[PDB]
Design a protein that fits this description.
This is part of a larger assembly, with 2 copies of chain A. Chain A is mainly alpha-helical. Helices cover about 35% and strands about 0% of the residues of chain A. Chains A and B meet through helix 3 of A and loops of B. Chains A, B: Belongs to the ClpA/ClpB family.
Chain lengths: ~80, ~80
Amino acid sequence: AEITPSYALGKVLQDAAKIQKQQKDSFIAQDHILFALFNDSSIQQIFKEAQVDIEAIKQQALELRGNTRIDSRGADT
Amino acid sequence: AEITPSYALGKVLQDAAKIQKQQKDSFIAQDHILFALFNDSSIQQIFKEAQVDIEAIKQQALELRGNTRIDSRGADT
């Protein structure tokens, strides 16, 4: 079970670096790994299950707290 | 003269706007414009002088400024 990093998912290892700093921060966070997941992790379908879309995450990433995390410390978002 | 961005390049100024979040910045600096230049500013060909997209700039922006360079001044560096 889950014996693989699954770069298909695990590109976010790099790919999540998108919004980590752009909150004026250090490293990647929950929304912020998720931020790259709207690219990566999503159910993009007839009813597309992919969530707050272009800014709205980053928006709401800022719009909720924002600068939401720094490094490793405190529950991620 | 100086009429048109060369849309192949034209995106790059707006593509320059892309990295302020992973460069962890509110504003888009001279490292960031070049950051987008990593595509059309290049020779990407049989003999490729590309511009290194992610790897080298970041950690050498970890060398050169960081989040440290939030932005909102003019351009000094």
